Design a protein around this ligand. Structure first.
Ligand SMILES: N=C(N)c1cc(-c2ccccc2)c(CNC(=O)c2ccc3c(c2)CCO3)s1
Ligand SMILES: N=C(N)c1cc(-c2ccccc2)c(CNC(=O)c2ccc3c(c2)CCO3)s1
Ligand SMILES: N=C(N)c1cc(-c2ccccc2)c(CNC(=O)c2ccc3c(c2)CCO3)s1
Ligand SMILES: N=C(N)c1cc(-c2ccccc2)c(CNC(=O)c2ccc3c(c2)CCO3)s1
Ligand SMILES: N=C(N)c1cc(-c2ccccc2)c(CNC(=O)c2ccc3c(c2)CCO3)s1
Ligand SMILES: N=C(N)c1cc(-c2ccccc2)c(CNC(=O)c2ccc3c(c2)CCO3)s1
Ligand SMILES: [Ca+2]
Ligand SMILES: [Ca+2]
Ligand SMILES: [Cl-]
Ligand SMILES: [Cl-]
Ligand SMILES: [Mg+2]
Ligand SMILES: [Mg+2]
Ligand SMILES: [Mg+2]
Ligand SMILES: [Mg+2]
Lengths: 5, 230, 230, 5
C-alpha cells in the first residue's frame, strides 16, 4: 500500500 | 482575466458546481480567479482551493510516476523522456501557480492563525511536489523551502490550535511523509506521526461527536503510515 | 502543428504512453496528430483513436448531465446556465473535431469494409453525442445525420462481417441505444438489440476461445440493455 | 442502472 497524505 | 471579468461570488458558485461535476481543472481556474480578487478566503473557500489543486496535481503526479517507471525500465528513442518531461513541466507549472497565489498574497494577508497555518501547509505541499520531480542544482533548495514552510506551520499550529484540529493533523501527516520519502529522515517521520497520533487520541475526550469523526478520520491515516513504517 | 512537427511513429508511441498514464486529453491530441499525417490507421491505431476521444467526451458528457440536472432543479442567477453552456460548448468542439477527422479524410480513404464500418460507427456516435445536448433548429438534422451514418455502417457490416465481429456488435449496441433514447424508437431499439444478440449467439460455435471471449463481452452489454428495456 | 454503450 502507498503511504497516505 | 481570464477570470477578472467574473464576480467573486460567481467564481465561488462555479467552483462548487465544477466540484460536483468532477471538473477539477475548471474548479482550480475558478478558485485562482477568486483568490486574485484580493479578498479573504473563508474556511470553506480554502477547502475549495485545496481540493481543486489537489486533484489537478494528483493526476499529473500519478501520470509522472507511470512515465518515470517506464523511463527507468527503458534505461526506444527519445519519446518516453520527452513525454515525461512534458508532464513534468506541466506539473511544475501548476505548483508554481499555487505557490504564486500563496506568496502573492494569501499568506501575508492571512490574519488568523488558522488561515496562516492552512496556507503554509499548502506551501509545504507544493514545494514537496516540486521536490518529487527535482533533480537539479536546486533540489536541495526546494527541499529546504518545503521544510521551512511546514516547520513554521507546525510552530503556529502547536501554539494556537488544539492537537485534534484536522488542519493541524493533516499538516503533521504531510510533514511526516515529507520526512520519510523526501528528506531521507524516516525516524523523524515515525516520531512525528506517533506523537501527533497519541496527542490527538488524548484530546478526543474534549470533542463533540462531529469533531471526533473529523479528527479520527485523519488519525486513521497516521495509523496507516506508522503501520507501513514500523 | 501543434503535432505537425512530430513523427507519426512518435505520436503513436506517445498515445500509448498517455493511455498508460490515463492522460486521455494528451492521448487524443497525439491521435489527432497521427490522423492528420494522412496515412492509414491500423486496427490497433483506430482503437487508440476511439478510446482517447471516448474518454475525453465521456468526462464532458458526465459533467454536462450533472450540470443539466442542477439547472433543471433550479427552474440563483445565470451561473448554472453559464457553466453548463461552457461545458456544452467544449463538448461540441470535441465532437466537431472528431467528425472533421472522419470527414477529412478518414472515411473516404478507408479502403476496407472493416475500416469503413469503424469510422462510420464513430460518425454515428459523435453525432449522437451532439444530439444529446441539441435543442435548436438543427437537433432534427443532427439526429438524421447520426441515423444515416449508423445505417450505412450497419448495411456494410451485415454484408461484409460475421455477426460475432466485435465492431459490428458494438455498432449495433450503440445504434440500438440511439433508437431508444435519441430517436424515441424503443421498439426499434429492442428489435435491434435482440436480433443482434441472437444472431451472435448462433455464430459462437465458429469461434476460437479468444474470439468467443471478445464477442461474449459485447453480448453481455446487449443483454444488460434488453434486461433494462423489457 | 444506466444503459450501456
Ligand atoms: N466543497 C468541499 N470539498 C468542502 C467544503 C468544506 C466546508 C464547508 C462549509 C464550511 C467549512 C468547510 C469542507 C470541510 N472539509 C472537509 O470536510 C474535509 C476536508 C479534508 C478531508 C476530509 C474532509 C476527509 C479527509 O480529508 S470540504
Ligand atoms: N475549528 C475546527 N476544528 C473546524 C471549524 C470548521 C468550520 C469553520 C467555519 C465554518 C464552518 C465550519 C471546520 C470544518 N472545516 C474543515 O475545513 C475541515 C478540514 C479538513 C478536514 C475536516 C474538516 C475533517 C477531516 O479533514 S473544522
Ligand atoms: N519505531 C517505533 N516508534 C515503533 C517500534 C515498535 C515496535 C517495537 C518492538 C517490537 C515491535 C514493534 C512500534 C509498535 N507499533 C506502535 O506502537 C504503533 C503502530 C501503529 C500505530 C500506532 C502505534 C499509533 C497509531 O498507529 S512503534
Ligand atoms: N490500446 C488499446 N486500448 C487497444 C489496442 C487494441 C489492439 C491491439 C493490437 C491489435 C489490434 C487492436 C485494442 C483491441 N480492442 C480491444 O481489445 C477492446 C476494444 C473495445 C472494448 C473491449 C476491448 C472491451 C469492451 O470494449 S484496444
Ligand atoms: N476480425 C476480428 N474479429 C478482429 C481482428 C483483430 C486484429 C486485427 C489486426 C491485428 C490484430 C488483431 C481484433 C482485435 N481488435 C479489436 O479491435 C477489438 C475491438 C473491439 C472489441 C474487441 C476487440 C473485444 C471486445 O470489443 S478483432
Ligand atoms: N419486447 C420483447 N421483445 C420481449 C418481451 C419479453 C416478455 C414477453 C412476455 C413476458 C415477459 C417478457 C421478452 C423476454 N425477454 C427476453 O427474451 C430476453 C431478455 C434479455 C435478453 C435476451 C432476451 C437476449 C439477451 O438478453 S423480450
Ligand atoms: Ca527507532
Ligand atoms: Ca413490443
Ligand atoms: Cl511530448
Ligand atoms: Cl462559465
Ligand atoms: Mg465585484
Ligand atoms: Mg524537467
Ligand atoms: Mg515523417
Ligand atoms: Mg449551447
Amino acid at each position: 500500500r502507498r503511504r497516505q497524505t | 482575466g481570464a477570470m477578472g471579468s467574473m464576480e467573486r461570488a460567481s467564481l465561488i458558485q462555479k467552483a462548487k458546481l465544477a466540484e460536483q461535476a468532477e471538473r477539477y481543472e475548471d474548479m482550480a481556474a475558478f478558485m485562482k480567479g477568486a483568490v486574485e480578487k484580493g479578498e479573504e478566503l473563508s474556511c470553506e473557500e480554502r477547502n475549495l482551493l485545496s481540493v481543486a489543486y489537489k486533484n489537478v496535481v494528483g493526476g499529473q503526479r500519478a501520470a509522472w510516476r507511470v512515465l518515470s517507471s517506464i523511463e527507468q525500465k527503458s534505461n526506444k528513442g527519445p519519446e518516453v523522456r520527452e513525454y515525461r518531461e512534458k508532464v513534468e513541466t506541466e506539473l511544475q507549472g501548476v505548483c508554481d501557480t499555487v505557490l504564486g497565489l500563496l506568496d502573492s498574497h494569501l499568506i501575508k494577508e492571512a490574519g488568523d492563525a488558522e488561515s496562516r497555518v492552512f496556507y503554509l501547509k499548502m506551501k509545504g505541499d507544493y514545494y514537496r511536489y516540486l521536490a518529487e520531480v527535482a533533480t537539479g542544482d536546486d533540489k536541495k533548495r526546494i527541499i529546504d523551502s518545503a521544510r521551512s514552510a511546514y516547520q513554521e506551520a507546525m510552530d503556529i499550529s502547536k501554539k494556537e490550535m488544539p492537537p485534534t484540529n484536522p488542519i493541524r493533523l493533516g499538516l503533521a501527516l504531510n510533514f511526516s511523509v515529507f520526512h520519510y520519502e523526501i528528506a531521507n529522515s524516516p525516524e523523524e517521520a515515525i516520531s512525528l506521526a506517533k506523537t501527533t497520533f497519541d496527542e490527538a487520541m488524548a484530546d478526543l475526550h474534549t470533542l463533540s461527536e462531529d469533531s471526533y469523526k473529523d479528527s479520527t478520520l485523519i488519525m486513521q491515516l497516521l495509523r496507516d503510515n506508522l503501520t507501513l513504517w514500523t
